Design an enzyme around this catalytic site. Structure first.
Site, PDB file in Angstrom:
ATOM      1  N   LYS A 267      45.583  21.081  32.167  1.00  0.00           N
ATOM      2  CA  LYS A 267      45.576  22.310  31.793  1.00  0.00           C
ATOM      3  C   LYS A 267      47.198  22.822  31.483  1.00  0.00           C
ATOM      4  CE  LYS A 267      44.729  27.178  32.932  1.00  0.00           C
ATOM      5  NZ  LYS A 267      43.806  28.271  33.082  1.00  0.00           N
TER       6      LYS A 267
ATOM      7  N   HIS B 292      51.586  23.635  27.906  1.00  0.00           N
ATOM      8  CA  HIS B 292      53.182  23.861  27.955  1.00  0.00           C
ATOM      9  C   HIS B 292      53.748  22.735  27.497  1.00  0.00           C
ATOM     10  CE1 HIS B 292      52.744  27.641  29.788  1.00  0.00           C
ATOM     11  NE2 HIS B 292      51.846  27.265  30.511  1.00  0.00           N
TER      12      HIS B 292
ATOM     13  N   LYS C  83      38.687  14.027  11.420  1.00  0.00           N
ATOM     14  CA  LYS C  83      38.421  13.875   9.824  1.00  0.00           C
ATOM     15  C   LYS C  83      39.326  13.259   8.985  1.00  0.00           C
ATOM     16  CE  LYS C  83      36.993  17.253   5.964  1.00  0.00           C
ATOM     17  NZ  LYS C  83      36.537  18.684   5.895  1.00  0.00           N
TER      18      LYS C  83
ATOM     19  N   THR D 253      41.745  19.063   2.467  1.00  0.00           N
ATOM     20  CA  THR D 253      42.952  19.885   1.706  1.00  0.00           C
ATOM     21  C   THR D 253      42.990  21.487   2.044  1.00  0.00           C
ATOM     22  OG1 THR D 253      42.474  18.429  -0.240  1.00  0.00           O
ATOM     23  CG2 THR D 253      43.761  20.504  -0.505  1.00  0.00           C
TER      24      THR D 253
ATOM     25  N   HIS E 254      32.437  23.594  -0.445  1.00  0.00           N
ATOM     26  CA  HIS E 254      32.995  22.297  -0.289  1.00  0.00           C
ATOM     27  C   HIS E 254      34.311  21.951  -1.311  1.00  0.00           C
ATOM     28  CE1 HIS E 254      33.194  17.779  -1.078  1.00  0.00           C
ATOM     29  NE2 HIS E 254      32.617  18.180  -2.459  1.00  0.00           N
ATOM     30  N   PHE E 255      35.101  21.302  -0.871  1.00  0.00           N
ATOM     31  CA  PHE E 255      36.317  20.803  -1.364  1.00  0.00           C
ATOM     32  C   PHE E 255      36.057  19.468  -2.194  1.00  0.00           C
ATOM     33  CE2 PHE E 255      40.749  21.868  -2.402  1.00  0.00           C
ATOM     34  CZ  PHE E 255      41.263  20.777  -2.976  1.00  0.00           C
ATOM     35  N   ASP E 256      36.222  19.309  -3.309  1.00  0.00           N
ATOM     36  CA  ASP E 256      35.497  17.892  -3.859  1.00  0.00           C
ATOM     37  C   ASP E 256      36.870  17.168  -4.161  1.00  0.00           C
ATOM     38  OD1 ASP E 256      32.924  16.562  -4.540  1.00  0.00           O
ATOM     39  OD2 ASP E 256      33.935  16.192  -6.444  1.00  0.00           O
TER      40      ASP E 256
HETATM   41  N1  LIG Z   1      52.515  30.006  41.895  1.00  0.00           N
HETATM   42  C1  LIG Z   1      51.404  29.817  41.262  1.00  0.00           C
HETATM   43  N2  LIG Z   1      50.481  28.554  41.600  1.00  0.00           N
HETATM   44  C2  LIG Z   1      49.322  28.017  40.790  1.00  0.00           C
HETATM   45  N3  LIG Z   1      48.812  28.696  39.684  1.00  0.00           N
HETATM   46  C3  LIG Z   1      49.693  30.010  39.394  1.00  0.00           C
HETATM   47  C4  LIG Z   1      50.943  30.313  40.082  1.00  0.00           C
HETATM   48  N4  LIG Z   1      51.415  31.501  39.496  1.00  0.00           N
HETATM   49  C5  LIG Z   1      50.551  31.807  38.537  1.00  0.00           C
HETATM   50  N5  LIG Z   1      49.434  30.935  38.375  1.00  0.00           N
HETATM   51  C6  LIG Z   1      48.415  30.802  37.464  1.00  0.00           C
HETATM   52  O1  LIG Z   1      48.906  29.991  36.368  1.00  0.00           O
HETATM   53  C7  LIG Z   1      48.125  29.938  35.443  1.00  0.00           C
HETATM   54  C8  LIG Z   1      48.464  29.548  34.010  1.00  0.00           C
HETATM   55  O2  LIG Z   1      49.371  30.231  33.633  1.00  0.00           O
HETATM   56  P1  LIG Z   1      50.363  29.895  32.460  1.00  0.00           P
HETATM   57  O3  LIG Z   1      50.049  28.786  31.387  1.00  0.00           O
HETATM   58  O4  LIG Z   1      51.765  29.151  33.156  1.00  0.00           O
HETATM   59  O5  LIG Z   1      51.154  31.146  31.933  1.00  0.00           O
HETATM   60  C9  LIG Z   1      52.377  31.617  32.288  1.00  0.00           C
HETATM   61  C10 LIG Z   1      52.359  33.010  32.922  1.00  0.00           C
HETATM   62  O6  LIG Z   1      51.243  32.673  34.183  1.00  0.00           O
HETATM   63  C11 LIG Z   1      51.489  33.808  31.972  1.00  0.00           C
HETATM   64  C12 LIG Z   1      51.727  35.375  32.433  1.00  0.00           C
HETATM   65  O7  LIG Z   1      52.764  35.753  32.415  1.00  0.00           O
HETATM   66  O8  LIG Z   1      52.429  33.518  31.072  1.00  0.00           O
HETATM   67  C13 LIG Z   1      53.047  32.270  30.762  1.00  0.00           C
HETATM   68  N6  LIG Z   1      54.690  32.616  30.787  1.00  0.00           N
HETATM   69  C14 LIG Z   1      55.076  33.271  31.619  1.00  0.00           C
HETATM   70  C15 LIG Z   1      56.388  33.495  31.346  1.00  0.00           C
HETATM   71  C16 LIG Z   1      57.032  32.555  30.515  1.00  0.00           C
HETATM   72  O9  LIG Z   1      58.423  32.833  30.372  1.00  0.00           O
HETATM   73  N7  LIG Z   1      56.410  31.758  30.105  1.00  0.00           N
HETATM   74  C17 LIG Z   1      55.081  31.570  30.222  1.00  0.00           C
HETATM   75  O10 LIG Z   1      54.530  30.508  29.662  1.00  0.00           O
HETATM   76  C18 LIG Z   1      47.471  31.447  35.441  1.00  0.00           C
HETATM   77  O11 LIG Z   1      46.042  31.620  35.457  1.00  0.00           O
HETATM   78  C19 LIG Z   1      48.149  32.055  36.639  1.00  0.00           C
HETATM   79  O12 LIG Z   1      47.000  32.728  37.400  1.00  0.00           O
HETATM   80  N1  LIG Z   2      28.004  19.335  -4.033  1.00  0.00           N
HETATM   81  C1  LIG Z   2      27.923  19.764  -2.766  1.00  0.00           C
HETATM   82  N2  LIG Z   2      27.393  20.902  -2.358  1.00  0.00           N
HETATM   83  C2  LIG Z   2      27.389  21.260  -1.086  1.00  0.00           C
HETATM   84  N3  LIG Z   2      27.868  20.667  -0.151  1.00  0.00           N
HETATM   85  C3  LIG Z   2      28.414  19.504  -0.507  1.00  0.00           C
HETATM   86  C4  LIG Z   2      28.493  18.851  -1.824  1.00  0.00           C
HETATM   87  N4  LIG Z   2      29.269  17.812  -1.748  1.00  0.00           N
HETATM   88  C5  LIG Z   2      29.491  17.648  -0.555  1.00  0.00           C
HETATM   89  N5  LIG Z   2      29.071  18.629   0.230  1.00  0.00           N
HETATM   90  C6  LIG Z   2      29.387  18.737   1.811  1.00  0.00           C
HETATM   91  O1  LIG Z   2      30.590  19.513   1.968  1.00  0.00           O
HETATM   92  C7  LIG Z   2      30.878  19.280   3.486  1.00  0.00           C
HETATM   93  C8  LIG Z   2      32.208  19.723   3.776  1.00  0.00           C
HETATM   94  O2  LIG Z   2      32.996  18.949   3.333  1.00  0.00           O
HETATM   95  P1  LIG Z   2      34.602  19.259   2.898  1.00  0.00           P
HETATM   96  O3  LIG Z   2      35.019  20.126   3.932  1.00  0.00           O
HETATM   97  O4  LIG Z   2      34.457  19.828   1.458  1.00  0.00           O
HETATM   98  O5  LIG Z   2      35.136  18.108   2.935  1.00  0.00           O
HETATM   99  C9  LIG Z   2      35.753  17.174   1.648  1.00  0.00           C
HETATM  100  C10 LIG Z   2      34.555  15.914   1.417  1.00  0.00           C
HETATM  101  O6  LIG Z   2      33.406  16.363   1.825  1.00  0.00           O
HETATM  102  C11 LIG Z   2      35.324  15.145   2.393  1.00  0.00           C
HETATM  103  C12 LIG Z   2      34.812  13.639   2.055  1.00  0.00           C
HETATM  104  O7  LIG Z   2      35.302  13.199   0.775  1.00  0.00           O
HETATM  105  O8  LIG Z   2      36.684  15.263   2.388  1.00  0.00           O
HETATM  106  C13 LIG Z   2      36.913  16.422   1.982  1.00  0.00           C
HETATM  107  N6  LIG Z   2      38.128  16.455   0.823  1.00  0.00           N
HETATM  108  C14 LIG Z   2      37.800  15.349  -0.081  1.00  0.00           C
HETATM  109  C15 LIG Z   2      38.543  15.131  -1.014  1.00  0.00           C
HETATM  110  C16 LIG Z   2      39.782  16.027  -0.998  1.00  0.00           C
HETATM  111  O9  LIG Z   2      40.541  15.957  -1.961  1.00  0.00           O
HETATM  112  N7  LIG Z   2      39.828  17.216  -0.104  1.00  0.00           N
HETATM  113  C17 LIG Z   2      39.231  17.264   0.609  1.00  0.00           C
HETATM  114  O10 LIG Z   2      39.314  18.396   1.702  1.00  0.00           O
HETATM  115  C18 LIG Z   2      30.511  17.798   3.682  1.00  0.00           C
HETATM  116  O11 LIG Z   2      29.612  17.748   4.617  1.00  0.00           O
HETATM  117  C19 LIG Z   2      29.843  17.351   2.313  1.00  0.00           C
HETATM  118  O12 LIG Z   2      28.566  16.911   2.850  1.00  0.00           O
END
Ligand SMILES: Nc1ncnc2c1ncn2[C@@H]1O[C@H](COP(=O)(O)O[C@@H]2[C@H](O)[C@@H](CO)O[C@H]2n2ccc(=O)[nH]c2=O)[C@@H](O)[C@H]1O
Ligand SMILES: Nc1ncnc2c1ncn2[C@@H]1O[C@H](COP(=O)(O)O[C@@H]2[C@H](O)[C@@H](CO)O[C@H]2n2ccc(=O)[nH]c2=O)[C@@H](O)[C@H]1O
Lengths: 124, 124
Positions: free
Chosen positions: A7, A12, A41, A45, A119-121
């Site tokens: 985590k 981070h 994927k 595009t 869908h993007f073709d």
């Molecule tokens: N001493 C400790 N030991 C273990 N877990 C701790 C402690 N102190 C706090 N925690 C927990 O750490 C968990 C994860 O937190 P983080 O991803 O580090 O998040 C940081 C902080 O907890 C949150 C709240 O301020 O912001 C972030 N934070 C803060 C300041 C900064 O400069 N950068 C940053 O990423 C939180 O659930 C918190 O309960």
């Molecule tokens: N004519 C149609 N009508 C409805 N849904 C369709 C059709 N043809 C394809 N689909 C579906 O659309 C769904 C979503 O797909 P997309 O996000 O569009 O994905 C595109 C395409 O299906 C996949 C496979 O080639 O790559 C992407 N793709 C392709 C080429 C390109 O230049 N850019 C791009 O984003 C896929 O499950 C496909 O089954």
């Protein structure tokens, strides 16, 4: 239960030379958006245009999907996107991705009522 | 059960102008490391030194924790870390963090056997 030690590493530790580097975008986003759970994927595009611009594609040029389905739509305009492709070294659960930022037309499939992206073709 | 539409947003939408900006390190990291579930964790520090260098702190200067516990240790040397602090605008589920990079001595709480870091207490 997760141990208090594991985590702390989860909450981070991020050991390395330059962790806020652009090249890490896919690695963190793929992780944040939950596409690294259970398996890595291979390909995903991300789109940086508004949600409203992307939902509108469902009203634009109708095209056939790569898998032969017919509910895909191509965008009129080029969009800012990022491609996340799984790298060579990637191994669950050490999921790693190359980050590629491009501007291209997107193709999405659309569905439901009302019809929204599900869908993007591909990108072109 | 997640709708196909919400899933698309989760998997492909990252609307914005500079999504891979270093200043987004904390928003991405805090999400990846699961500290944005249920509530937004207000403060959280990431350490960029190796794990061994951090584990070693548990054998350095013993100090009192800020909550009065006595299992805290302060690194002998300064360390490369990043502080993530929630911004004023932040409100779950819309957690948002400022990313700050410093070089400071860290203070961790250590526990278990062997004795390893279990809590981050402060940096100085
Ligand atoms: N001493 C400790 N030991 C273990 N877990 C701790 C402690 N102190 C706090 N925690 C927990 O750490 C968990 C994860 O937190 P983080 O991803 O580090 O998040 C940081 C902080 O907890 C949150 C709240 O301020 O912001 C972030 N934070 C803060 C300041 C900064 O400069 N950068 C940053 O990423 C939180 O659930 C918190 O309960
Ligand atoms: N004519 C149609 N009508 C409805 N849904 C369709 C059709 N043809 C394809 N689909 C579906 O659309 C769904 C979503 O797909 P997309 O996000 O569009 O994905 C595109 C395409 O299906 C996949 C496979 O080639 O790559 C992407 N793709 C392709 C080429 C390109 O230049 N850019 C791009 O984003 C896929 O499950 C496909 O089954």
């Amino acid at each position: 239960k997760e141990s208090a030690a594991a985590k702390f590493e989860r909450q981070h530790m991020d050991s390395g030379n330059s962790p806020s580097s652009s090249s890490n975008y896919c690695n963190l986003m793929m992780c944040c958006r939950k596409m690294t759970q259970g398996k890595c994927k291979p390909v995903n595009t991300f789109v940086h245009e508004s949600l409203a611009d992307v939902k509108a594609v469902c009203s634009q040029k109708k095209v056939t999907c790569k898998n032969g389905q017919t509910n895909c739509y191509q965008s009129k305009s080029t969009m800012r996107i990022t491609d996340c492709r799984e790298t060579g070294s990637s191994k669950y659960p050490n999921c790693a991705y190359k980050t590629t930022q491009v501007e291209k037309h997107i193709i999405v499939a659309c569905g439901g009522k009302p019809s929204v992206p599900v869908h993007f073709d591909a990108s072109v």
